[PDB]
């Protein structure tokens, strides 16, 4: 499923013209400030829910479990601990 | 014809590191492969060096590690580099496996590099487990004991096998000397399998974040990915530096600075952090043999991803529901990790069982269902 | 700039020689600089600072 | 899963009035959130092609369709590596998201599945 | 587990060595050695430390040779093969109070005082735990605590009952540098000394780390420039498509 | 859009002084500095690391 | 004398007064309970470790930095 | 009291059981026991519980007097052994093994 240079296995290409300029002719950091602020904000905004939802849910689960565990091993939690075991 | 192409030896290097045709759009998650190669090289260099100063005999082992720390020039560095790189090796391998699962790298035509990969992961676990025993501190001894008794769960011959792996009736000098020899060997085996999974990959080439063919648009591996790999090499070395020089013991257990004592069992025996999720899965099943099966199955189940993923599309970039499911799967794997190091107490017992069920149901139920539904949504949605 | 390029950069043999000579100088000067800086931020704490009492 | 499967199941849903009433709006939002149109792709551009069946279907595409697909893949790869999205006419409009490949793959698969059946025929 | 079973967690004290760029205070190290020598060494060994280790850290070559030369070590047998003793040398290890575990336990109501060479690394808390433990014996155990025989109440110790009694009291040591030897001062000094004993490369390690951080950061910056420079023809690529 | 002789707009990226020796020299300064720190870092690494093989303090 | 003595006393009477009173009340209850007969044949014997920990944790938070500043 | 004698690297728990301890052990119906055994099968002398003090689950040493059956509790995975050293609760499948021991004298046993 992959060939090599000259016969990579692409369907025939026709009609595309590609253009680029030399690394020495270009400013490598052109538009860096705009990218760093606006591009990163857009990319992050669009992915935020996919991180926030699972992280927040599992953090809540952990928080509840660890708080209960702490409470069960206090004096106040004696009776509830006795039942739990 | 250029020498790099003409000469058969040079041509093999050329095909992997120079002329190798890569997708032009690999993102930074494609950099863990080279980080894993870096960890392997650091572990070989530091490991062989430690072997020049370490004594595998149980009467001298712990002391030989102290001699390395205290007397050998830069021995402290070589020791801490070796110990911390073992952790970084697992961070990079989990990232690499995470990348592979998210982007569907396990799908045809890359089932074989993925399946060899699963074996590499098992070899890393065994390598790291045996290396940890070599210190012969309290965590070393008891770690060996407990893990080498998982073989007792095997019916009939199980106990005989345990004594065979110990070279006696308990973990002792025979076990330590054999773990040294095997710890030395295993990284070479691991390097061979790492080479095999690359050769297997070379038939399809790298996948890419869009999940489409890159045959239309290829970039040479050098100089583009060479120089892109340097960025993460230096980011890695920064992380390495902060641990090795400023916090060398953050990832370790203080009890491993106590010499092994077969009588006293330490208050809490937990594995190294990177094994913690598998230990939580084992605790979840009350039965001995049940627990062992579950724990091994948790790794071997990765081999069925090619089958249970029913999607007509490779990878999760364009699959919102699959992305949510993947997020929950990863966070559950981290919760299992955390539960691996809590005390066996309420309510963590039941929580560990729920997280274990979720772990397996990802492979067996959710991914097959979600991938089926998304297929239908793509078709109806674009009509 | 032309002159500098022509002398130190154009020939790779010269470029590599310049890089290695610079690395040698950097190594020696950076050593000395860090030593002094480390001694100033950790002043009165090191053995060299109390040695004179003994 | 085979394209045939996906197409048949979809047709069962589209038939049922109740089912279509609840599934079609969900599928349209799924597609909106999927965001492949924002890289100038058509849905069919995303289908896994590294299989004998799909290689055969792609070889049977009309040359013009084939040339256009090559361009959309190259263009999307350039957006990907630049971390940009399509703008203006590069965005795939819903009316441009045509199933150009589905007919070809359904024919390739039809034959492949008939061949499997007939390889197992039993003279009665 | 109950908090008692865990032990109270020690405060985070501002040690001189806390801080990416901070060494130990060597004057504190020297004072801490004096506390070890005069108080702890009665029950605790420091087996991993040789006299040479003190030299250029806490003591001059002459002071350390003087410490070594006051002791007797086993020599090689004489010509009739009879045992002999010799005076100590810088290569010798600091000798412990007891010949074996059995003798150690007999002297300490069954408890075995650990060797202190690695104790700062072998306990969660490190110096803070050592300082907290030594200074954290309450005059009276909290009402309701039943101590086992030979045990002393200390909340920092897991379970609360430790076989080691309080040993630091104001003025048990007379420091040679004129520092007032209060319980707190002595605990701070000895905790520092023991931390040094566990990790004697500490000072050199952190200085080399500073050098590494600087070089590696610069290399990371330059690697980002070079990557962007090399990749710009690919990033900047433009297409015109004319459908055939 | 159609004519392939109308080069796409590269003005946001083109440097005016692209053909000058000063322009090249700058980029070689960056490459050279990187090579220099890599050389100094390798030398430090090799020297410190190999020193483990010299007689240890106890010897 | 030991600077810690004064600093600890000051912190107990001041910022950690609620916890001081809790510990005190606990001690009173437990001593009284031990005074009562057939205490030795009781199922549950209350201690004051919990309250003690809360007090000590508090004192340490208000003192640690001050103490090391005067050594 | 319970002693800990090293024997082939394994710990040996030797408990000098009181009368009432023996009684407590002889109560549990053999029927409800993962590993069904009575104390009489375990000890050859009711006053000398001699066991291999390694937990039958994975191989840690149980902390004695602790438990829920007030014999031995393995801290590793929370398995509870009895005054006979029988498993009552937790992952451990078997009762704490008994070594081959003989009373040469009434004051000394060999293992
Ligand atoms: C270990 C040793 C250290 C070595 C470092 C290696 C780590 C590098 C790596 O793989 O991650 C960098 C990686 C940047 O890689 P990239 O090549 O810019 O984009 C890869 C994705 O396509 C980027 O996805 P995207 O283009 O959709 O942008 C998403 C990203 C923004 O990506 C960034 O550019 C950052 O932001 C987030 O997803 C943040 C989550 C929201 C929380 C609030 O950052 C992330 O993608 C982080 C998001 C992961 C969740
Ligand atoms: C924590 C949960 C992570 C969920 C990730 C959800 C996707 C997301 O937002 O990530 C950003 C990006 C999204 O990138 P993307 O490639 O899908 O999208 C790029 C932008 N578009 C869509 C416009 C083309 O995802 C990644 O880069 C994911 C890599 C996964 C690595 C996970 C490591 C975990 C280790 C556990 C191993 C077992
Ligand atoms: C790991 C050790 C690193 C050693 C590198 C030290 C000096 C080499 C160097 O900087 O290479 C620059 C040189 C030149 O980089 P260059 O190839 O970009 O420059 C060529 C163009 N001229 C000569 C006009 C400037 O690279 C090499 O010669 C390759 C060796 C790198 C390793
Ligand atoms: C660690 C140290 C980093 C590498 C040190 C080399 C110095 C780099 C400067 C030299 C340089 O830029 O010249 C190139 C050499 O790079 C090269 O030839 C190598 C390019 C980058 C090397 C790193 C490759 C991947 C790193 C990840 C590790 C892989 C895992 C294995 C452990 C020539 O090259 P050019 O084509 O740009 O020349 C263009 C003109 N001649
Ligand atoms: C094996 C582990 C690899 C990780 C290396 C990280 C730092 C290790 C270097 C040792 C060290 O402490 O060096 C410091 C400087 O760090 C540095 O400057 C080194 C960081 C450089 C990053 C990597 C560059 C190449 C290193 C790997 C190549 C080795 C083989 C190639 C020939 C200061 O130590 P010092 O300055 O006192 O040292 C004497 C010379 N004055
Ligand atoms: C005369 C006896 C004696 C003196 C003096 C003594 N110790 Fe100890 N120490 C012990 C005993 C016994 C233990 C073991 C306690 C136990 O495990 O219950 C111990 C335990 C310790 C522990 C470890 C507690 C743990 O977490 O296991 C540290 C640290 C310690 N001692 C440090 C010191 C320092 C520092 C000094 C004096 C400056 C000191 N000791 C003086 C007898 C002594
Ligand atoms: C020593 C450990 C390993 C090393 C050094 C290693 C190295 C590499 C390298 C260099 C690549 C190509 C570049 C990249 O995609 O990052 C790669 C690709 C891959 N590796 Fe690994 N690998 C290791 C372990 C694993 C493991 C544990 C798995 C799977 C469980 C795995 C599965 C793969 C797959 C499927 C690919 C192809 C991904 C793609 O490009 O789409 N590898 N590996
Ligand atoms: C994949 C490669 C490797 C991994 C993941 C690995 C992992 C480990 C780990 C986790 C330890 C315990 C470290 C500690 O806490 O002190 C260790 C110790 C050790 N390893 Fe390795 N190792 C690897 C390769 C090697 C190799 C090739 C050697 C060659 C002999 C080696 C020799 C040693 C020695 C001698 C020790 C004991 C001294 C010590 O603890 O530092 N290792 N290894
Ligand atoms: C990764 C470190 C670098 C060392 C190289 C790794 C060692 C593994 C190499 C041996 C495995 C055989 O590797 C195999 O070699 C040949 C030629 O070399 C490659 O062949 C490829 O390149 C050559 C020219 O470059 C073409 O003739 C051929 O059409 C193409 O497929 C294979 O795609 C590769 O799979
Ligand atoms: C397919 C499984 C690969 C081998 C996994 C072995 C390493 C993790 C095993 C778990 C473990 C178990 C079971 C365990 O019980 C234990 O607790 C005492 C640990 O600490 C020594 C462990 O590490
Ligand atoms: S090891 Fe004894 S309970 Fe698991």
E222 lines ligand 5 (CB under 6 A): no
Spatial separation of the C-alpha atoms in residues B268 and B256, rounded to whole Å? 12
Helix axes B32-51, B173-201, angle to 10 degrees: 150
- Using left for φ > 0, alpha for ψ between -120 and 50, and beta otherwise, residue E145 falls in beta
| Pick from G15, G12, G14, G25: nearest CA to G51 | G25
Spatial separation of the C-alpha atoms in residues B317 and B326, rounded to whole Å? 11
Residue B318 backbone dihedrals phi, psi, to 5 degrees? -115, 25
The helix/strand/coil state of B313 is strand
Spatial separation of the C-alpha atoms in residues B80 and B56, rounded to whole Å? 19
Token pair in block for residue D58: 């792609």
Chain G residue with minimum CA distance to A76: G50
Whether residues D73 and B212 touch (CB distance < 8 A) is answered with yes
Q: Please tell me whether B82 is known to bind a ligand.
A: yes
Residue D99 backbone dihedrals phi, psi, to 5 degrees? -80, 70
Whether residues B238 and E226 touch (CB distance < 8 A) is answered with no
Within 8 A of G50 by CB-CB distance, chain A residues are: 74-75
Q: Which residues contact C13 (CB under 8 A, 6 or more apart)?
A: none
Top mutation candidate among F31, F32, F46 for ligand 4, by most atoms within 8 Å of CB: F31
The domain segmentation of chain B, as residue ranges, is 1-383
**B366-369: which pairs have CB atoms within 8 A and are 24 or more residues apart?**
B366/B325, B367/B305, B367/B308, B367/B309, B367/B322, B367/B325, B368/B308, B368/B309, B368/B310
Q: Give the number of C-alpha atoms closer than 13 A to the C-alpha of residue D40, restricted to the C-beta side.
A: 20
Q: Strand E72-74 to strand E85-87: parallel, antiparallel, or no bridges (unpaired)?
A: antiparallel
Number of domains chain A contains: 1
**b/e map B150-183, b = 16+ CB within 10 Å:** bbbbeeeebeeebeebbeeebbbbebbbbbbeeb
The helix/strand/coil state of F14 is strand
Spatial separation of the C-alpha atoms in residues B74 and B80, rounded to whole Å? 10
**B178-181: which pairs have CB atoms within 8 A and are 24 or more residues apart?**
B179/B130, B179/B133, B179/B134, B179/B144, B180/B54, B180/B56, B180/B134, B181/B56
Domain that holds residue G69: 1-71
The helix/strand/coil state of B137 is strand
CA dihedral E224, E225, E229, E235 (to 10 degrees): 50
Ligand nearest to the CA of B15: 9
Spatial separation of the C-alpha atoms in residues B67 and F6, rounded to whole Å? 72
Number of domains chain E contains: 2
Whether residues D78 and E244 touch (CB distance < 8 A) is answered with no
Spatial separation of the C-alpha atoms in residues E219 and F35, rounded to whole Å? 9
**B163-169: which pairs have CB atoms within 8 A and are 24 or more residues apart?**
B168/H8, B168/H9, B169/H8, B169/H9, B169/H10
Ligand nearest to the CA of H73: 11
Residue with tokens 């589905």: D102
The helix/strand/coil state of C25 is helix
Q: Let me know how long chain H is.
A: 111
Token pair in block for residue B253: 């257990």
Chain F: give the shortest CA distance to residue E215, in Å. Answer: 7
Q: Which atom of ligand 10 is closest in space to residue H76's alpha carbon?
A: 18
Spatial separation of the C-alpha atoms in residues B352 and B278, rounded to whole Å? 11
The domain segmentation of chain D, as residue ranges, is 1-124
Top mutation candidate among E6, E31, E44 for ligand 6, by most atoms within 8 Å of CB: E44
Number of domains chain C contains: 1
Residue with tokens 């009711």: H46
Q: Which residues contact H44 (CB under 8 A, 6 or more apart)?
A: H101, H103
B83 lines ligand 8 (CB under 6 A): yes
Q: Please tell me whether H60 is known to bind a ligand.
A: yes
* Contact E179/C at CB under 8 A: no
Domain that holds residue A5: 1-85
Helix axes B75-102, F21-50, angle to 10 degrees: 120
Does a cis peptide bond (omega within 30 degrees of 0) precede residue D39? no
Bridge partners of H87?
H81
Cβ-based interface (< 8 Å): residues of E facing G: 2-4, 8-15, 132, 135-136, 138, 142-145, 155, 160, 170, 182-185, 188
Indicate the burial class of D61 (C-beta count within 10 angstroms; 0-12, 13-18, 19 or more). Answer: middle
Ligand nearest to the CA of B330: 2
| Annotated catalytic residue, options H3, H36, H77, H97 | H77
| Contact call for residues B61 and B134 (beta carbons, < 8 A) | yes
| Contact call for residues G3 and G70 (beta carbons, < 8 A) | yes
Spatial separation of the C-alpha atoms in residues D92 and B247, rounded to whole Å? 52
| Pick from G22, B276, B381: nearest CA to D32 | B381
Spatial separation of the C-alpha atoms in residues A61 and B352, rounded to whole Å? 12
Whether residues E226 and F34 touch (CB distance < 8 A) is answered with yes
Question: Do chains G and E have 3 or more beta-carbon pairs under 8 angstroms?
Answer: yes
Spatial separation of the C-alpha atoms in residues C51 and C28, rounded to whole Å? 26
Q: Please tell me whether H55 is known to bind a ligand.
A: yes
| Annotated catalytic residue, options B53, B67, B222, B228 | B228
Spatial separation of the C-alpha atoms in residues G2 and B377, rounded to whole Å? 75
Helix axes B221-241, B32-51, angle to 10 degrees: 50
Bridge partners of H52?
H12
| Contact call for residues D97 and D28 (beta carbons, < 8 A) | no
Q: Let me know how long chain D is.
A: 124
Domain that holds residue E105: 4-200
Q: What is the DSSP string of chain E?
A: --HHHH-PPPP----TT-STT----HHHHHHHHHHHHHTGGGT---TT-BHHHHBTTTB-HHHHHHHHHTSEEEPPP-TTS---EEE--TTSBPPPS-SSHHHHHHTTTT--PPPSSSTTTSSTTTHHHHHHHHH---SS--TT--PPTT-EE-TTSTTSEESSPP---TTSS--TT-----HHHHHHHHHHHHHHHH-TTHHHHHHHHHHHHHHHHHHHHHHHHHHHHHHHHHHT-EEEE---
Q: How far is CA B358 from CA A65, B61, B311, B335, in A?
A: 17, 42, 21, 11
| Contact call for residues G66 and G7 (beta carbons, < 8 A) | yes
Nearest-5° Cα angle at D6, D5 to D7: 95
Rg (CA), chain C: 20
B29 lines ligand 8 (CB under 6 A): no
Between B and E, how many residue pairs show a Cβ–Cβ distance under 8 A? 74
Spatial separation of the C-alpha atoms in residues E146 and C19, rounded to whole Å? 73
Ligand nearest to the CA of A50: 2
Handedness of CA B78, B81, B83, B89 (dihedral sign): negative
Instruction: Say yes or no: E24 and E132 in one domain.
Output: yes
Q: Please tell me whether H16 is known to bind a ligand.
A: no
The helix/strand/coil state of B252 is coil
E120 lines ligand 6 (CB under 6 A): no
Terminal alpha carbon distance of chain H: 19
**Alpha-helix residue ranges (DSSP H) falling in chain B:** 3-6, 8-17, 32-51, 61-70, 75-102, 111-133, 138-147, 158-166, 173-201, 221-241, 276-284, 288-300, 305-308, 320-339, 348-361, 367-382
Whether residues G64 and E184 touch (CB distance < 8 A) is answered with no
B202 is catalytic: yes
| Pick from D40, D118, D105, D37: nearest CA to D72 | D40
Element spanning B23, H or E: strand B21-23
B272 is catalytic: yes
Q: What is the DSSP string of chain A?
A: ---BTTB--PPP--SEEEE---TTTB-TTTTHHHIIIIIHHHHHHHHHHHHHHHHHHHHHHHHHHHHHHHHHTSSTTHHHHHHH-
Classify residue B259 by its DSSP letter.
B
Token pair in block for residue G52: 């003690």
* Ligand 1, CB within 6 Å, residue ranges: A 40, 43-44, 47-48, 51; B 27-29, 91-92, 209, 232, 235-236, 239; D 83
Q: Which chains touch B (3 or more CB pairs under 8 A)?
A: A, D, E, F, H
Within 8 A of E198 by CB-CB distance, chain B residues are: 257
Chain A: give the shortest CA distance to residue G45, in Å. Answer: 11
| Contact call for residues E241 and F3 (beta carbons, < 8 A) | no
| Pick from G28, G1, G23, G3: nearest CA to G12 | G23
* E103 Cα: distance to centroid of ligand 6 (angstroms): 16
Q: Which residues contact E216 (CB under 8 A, 6 or more apart)?
A: B234, B237, B238, B241, F41
Spatial separation of the C-alpha atoms in residues E168 and E172, rounded to whole Å? 7
* F39 Cα: distance to centroid of ligand 4 (angstroms): 12
Residue A72 backbone dihedrals phi, psi, to 5 degrees? -65, -25
C29: how many CB neighbours lie within 10 A of its CB?
A: 10
CA dihedral E108, E112, E117, E122 (to 10 degrees): -130
- Using left for φ > 0, alpha for ψ between -120 and 50, and beta otherwise, residue B277 falls in alpha
Q: Strand E72-74 to strand B218-220: parallel, antiparallel, or no bridges (unpaired)?
A: unpaired
Bridge partners of H13?
H4, H51
Q: Which residue of B107, B312, B383 is in closest CB contact with D47? A: B312
Nearest-5° Cα angle at B203, B202 to B207: 70
Chain E residue with minimum CA distance to C52: E60
Positions of chain breaks in chain C, given as the residue before each break (C to N > 2.5 Å): none
C19 lines ligand 3 (CB under 6 A): yes
Nearest-5° Cα angle at B331, B251 to A37: 90
Chain C: give the shortest CA distance to residue F55, in Å. Answer: 24
| Pick from D63, H75, B3: nearest CA to E1 | H75
The helix/strand/coil state of B58 is coil
Spatial separation of the C-alpha atoms in residues D69 and A2, rounded to whole Å? 18
Whether residues B265 and H57 touch (CB distance < 8 A) is answered with no
Q: Please tell me whether H57 is known to bind a ligand.
A: yes
E216 lines ligand 5 (CB under 6 A): yes
Give the determination technique.
Answer: cryo-EM
- Helix H, strand E, coil C: the string for C26-54 is HHHHHHHHHHHHHHHHCCCCCHHHHHHHC
Token pair in block for residue E211: 């050098």
Classify residue B22 by its DSSP letter.
E
Spatial separation of the C-alpha atoms in residues H86 and H73, rounded to whole Å? 11
| Contact call for residues C8 and C15 (beta carbons, < 8 A) | yes
Instruction: Say yes or no: E113 and E229 in one domain.
Output: no
| Pick from A80, H58, G52: nearest CA to B153 | H58
| Pick from B230, E183, A27: nearest CA to F34 | B230
| Contact call for residues B166 and B175 (beta carbons, < 8 A) | yes
Q: What is the DSSP string of B71-95?
A: TSTTHHHHHHHHHHHHHHHHHHHHH
* B288 Cα: distance to centroid of ligand 11 (angstroms): 10
Q: How far is CA E179 from CA E2, E27, E29, E186, in A?
A: 40, 10, 13, 10
Number of domains chain G contains: 1
Cβ-based interface (< 8 Å): residues of A facing E: 14-23, 26-29, 73
| Pick from H47, H46, H52: nearest CA to H4 | H52
Within 8 A of B334 by CB-CB distance, chain A residues are: 58
Spatial separation of the C-alpha atoms in residues D30 and D39, rounded to whole Å? 16
* Contact B229/D at CB under 8 A: no
CA dihedral B163, B167, B169, B170 (to 10 degrees): -100
Token pair in block for residue B292: 């062992």
Whether residues E239 and A19 touch (CB distance < 8 A) is answered with yes
Q: Let me know how long chain C is.
A: 54
- Helix H, strand E, coil C: the string for chain H is CEEEEEECCEEEEEEECCHHHHHHHCCCCCCCCCCCCCHHHHCCCCCEEEEECCCCCCCCCCEECCCCCCCEEECCCCEEECCCCCEEECCCCCCCCCCCCEECCCCCEEC
Q: Give the resolution value in Å.
A: 2.6
Spatial separation of the C-alpha atoms in residues E147 and E153, rounded to whole Å? 7
* Contact E55/C at CB under 8 A: no
Residue with tokens 């003994």: C54
């Amino acid at each position: 499923y992959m060939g090599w240079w000259g016969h990579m296995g692409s369907p025939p290409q026709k009609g595309i013209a590609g253009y680029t300029i030399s690394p020495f002719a270009a400013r490598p950091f052109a538009g860096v400030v705009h990218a760093a602020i606006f591009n990163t904000f857009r990319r992050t905004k669009n992915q935020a829910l996919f991180v926030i939802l699972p992280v927040s849910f599992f953090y809540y689960v952990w928080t509840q479990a660890s708080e209960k565990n702490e409470w069960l091993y206090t004096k106040a939690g004696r009776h509830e601990l006795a039942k739990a075991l | 014809m250029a020498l790099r192409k003409k000469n058969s030896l040079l041509n093999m290097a050329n095909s992997y590191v120079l002329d190798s045709p890569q997708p032009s759009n690999l993102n930074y998650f494609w950099n863990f492969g080279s980080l894993l190669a870096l960890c392997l090289v650091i572990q070989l260099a530091t490991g062989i060096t430690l072997a020049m100063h370490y004594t595998s005999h149980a009467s001298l082992a712990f002391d030989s590690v102290e001699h390395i720390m205290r007397d050998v020039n830069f021995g402290w560095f070589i020791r801490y580099a070796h110990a911390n790189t073992a952790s970084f090796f697992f961070i990079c391998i989990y990232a690499h496996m995470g990348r592979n699962i998210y982007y569907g790298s396990y799908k045809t035509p890359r089932v074989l590099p993925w399946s060899i990969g699963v074996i590499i992961f098992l070899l890393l676990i065994i390598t790291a487990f045996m290396g940890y025993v070599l210190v012969f501190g309290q965590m070393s001894l008891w770690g060996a004991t407990v893990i080498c008794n998982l073989v007792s769960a095997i019916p009939w011959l199980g106990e005989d096998i345990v004594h065979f792996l110990w070279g006696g009736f308990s973990v002792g000098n025979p076990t330590l000397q054999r773990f040294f020899a095997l710890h030395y060997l295993m990284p070479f085996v691991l390097a061979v399998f790492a080479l095999l999974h690359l050769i297997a990959l070379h038939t399809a080439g790298s996948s890419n974040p869009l999940g489409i063919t890159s045959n239309v648009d290829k970039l040479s591996m050098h100089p583009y990915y060479s120089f892109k790999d340097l960025i993460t090499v230096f980011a890695f070395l920064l992380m390495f530096t902060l641990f090795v020089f400023f916090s060398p013991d953050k990832l370790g257990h203080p009890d491993n600075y106590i010499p092994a004592n077969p009588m006293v069992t330490p208050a809490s025996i937990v594995p190294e952090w990177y094994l913690l999720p598998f230990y939580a899965i084992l605790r979840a099943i009350p039965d001995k043999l049940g627990g062992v099966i579950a724990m091994v199955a948790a790794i071997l189940i990765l081999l069925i991803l090619p089958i249970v993923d029913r999607s007509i599309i490779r990878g999760n970039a364009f699959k919102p529901i699959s992305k949510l499911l993947f997020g929950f799967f990863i966070c559950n794997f981290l919760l299992l990790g955390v539960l691996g190091q809590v005390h066996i107490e309420p309510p963590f017992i039941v929580l560990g069982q729920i997280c274990t069920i979720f772990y397996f149901s990802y492979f067996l139920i959710l991914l097959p269902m979600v991938s089926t539904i998304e297929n239908i949504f793509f078709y109806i949605g674009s009509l | 700039a032309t002159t500098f390029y022509n002398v130190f950069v154009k020939r790779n043999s010269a470029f590599v020689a310049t890089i290695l000579a610079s690395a040698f100088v950097f190594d020696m000067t950076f050593e000395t600089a860090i030593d002094n800086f480390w001694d100033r931020i950790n002043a009165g704490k090191q053995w060299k600072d109390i040695r004179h009492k003994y | 899963a085979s394209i045939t499967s996906v197409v048949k199941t979809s047709e069962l849903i589209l038939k049922s009035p109740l089912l279509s009433k609840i599934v079609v709006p969900l599928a349209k939002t799924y597609v909106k959130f999927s965001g492949y149109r924002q890289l100038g792709f058509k849905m069919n551009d995303l289908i896994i092609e590294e299989t004998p069946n799909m290689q055969l279907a792609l070889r049977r595409l009309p040359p013009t369709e084939s040339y256009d697909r090559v361009y959309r893949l190259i263009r999307a790869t350039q957006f990907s590596l630049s971390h940009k999205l399509a703008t203006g006419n590069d965005i795939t409009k819903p009316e441009e998201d045509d199933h150009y490949l589905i007919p070809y793959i359904l024919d390739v698969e039809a034959e492949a599945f008939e061949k499997d059946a007939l390889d197992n025929l039993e003279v009665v | 587990m109950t908090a008692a079973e865990h032990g109270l967690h020690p405060a985070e004290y501002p040690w001189p060595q806390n801080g990416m760029l901070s060494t130990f205070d060597h004057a504190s190290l020297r004072r801490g050695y004096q506390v070890y020598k005069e108080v702890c060494a009665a029950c605790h060994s420091l087996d991993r430390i040789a006299w040479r280790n003190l030299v250029g850290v806490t003591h001059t070559t002459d002071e350390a040779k003087a410490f070594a030369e006051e002791l007797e070590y086993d020599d090689e047998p004489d010509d009739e093969g009879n045992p002999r003793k010799r005076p100590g040398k810088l290569a010798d290890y600091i000798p412990g109070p007891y010949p074996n575990e059995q003798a150690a336990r007999a002297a300490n109501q069954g408890a075995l005082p650990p060797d202190l060479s690695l104790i700062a690394k072998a306990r969660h808390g490190g110096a803070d735990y050592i300082f907290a433990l030594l200074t954290g014996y309450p005059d009276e155990p909290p009402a309701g605590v039943v101590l086992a025989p030979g045990m002393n109440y200390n909340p920092y110790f897991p379970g609360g009952g430790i076989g080691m009694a309080r040993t630091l009291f104001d003025g048990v040591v007379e420091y040679e540098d004129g520092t007032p030897a209060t319980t707190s001062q002595m605990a701070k000094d000895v905790a520092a000394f023991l931390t040094w004993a566990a990790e004697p490369e500490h000072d050199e390690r952190k200085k080399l780390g500073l050098k590494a951080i600087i070089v590696i950061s610069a290399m990371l910056g330059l690697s980002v420039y070079i990557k962007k420079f090399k990749w710009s023809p690919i990033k900047n690529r433009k297409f015109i498509y004319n459908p055939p | 859009g159609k004519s392939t002789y109308k080069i796409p707009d590269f003005t946001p990226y083109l440097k005016k002084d692209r053909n000058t020796d000063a322009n090249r020299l700058f980029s070689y300064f960056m490459i050279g500095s990187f090579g220099m720190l890599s050389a100094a870092g390798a030398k430090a690494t090799v020297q410190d690391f190999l020193s483990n093989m010299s007689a240890s303090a106890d010897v | 004398p030991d600077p810690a003595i004064a600093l600890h006393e000051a912190a107990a009477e001041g910022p950690c007064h609620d916890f001081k009173h809790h510990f005190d009340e606990c001690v009173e209850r437990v001593t009284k309970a031990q005074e009562a007969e057939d205490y030795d044949h009781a199922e549950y014997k209350e201690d004051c470790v919990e309250e003690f920990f809360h007090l000590q944790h508090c004192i340490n938070d208000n003192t640690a930095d001050k103490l090391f500043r005067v050594l | 009291k319970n002693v800990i004698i090293k024997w082939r690297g394994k710990p040996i728990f030797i408990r000098h059981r009181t009368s009432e301890e023996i009684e407590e052990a002889n109560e549990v119906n053999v029927a409800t026991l993962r590993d069904p055994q009575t104390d009489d099968e375990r000890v050859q002398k009711p006053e000398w519980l001699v066991m291999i003090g390694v937990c039958t689950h994975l191989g840690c040493v149980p902390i004695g007097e602790a438990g829920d059956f007030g014999g031995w509790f393995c801290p590793c995975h929370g398995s509870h052994y009895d005054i006979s050293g029988r498993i009552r609760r937790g992952p451990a499948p078997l009762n704490l093994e008994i070594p081959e021991y003989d009373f040469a004298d009434a004051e000394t046993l060999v293992i």
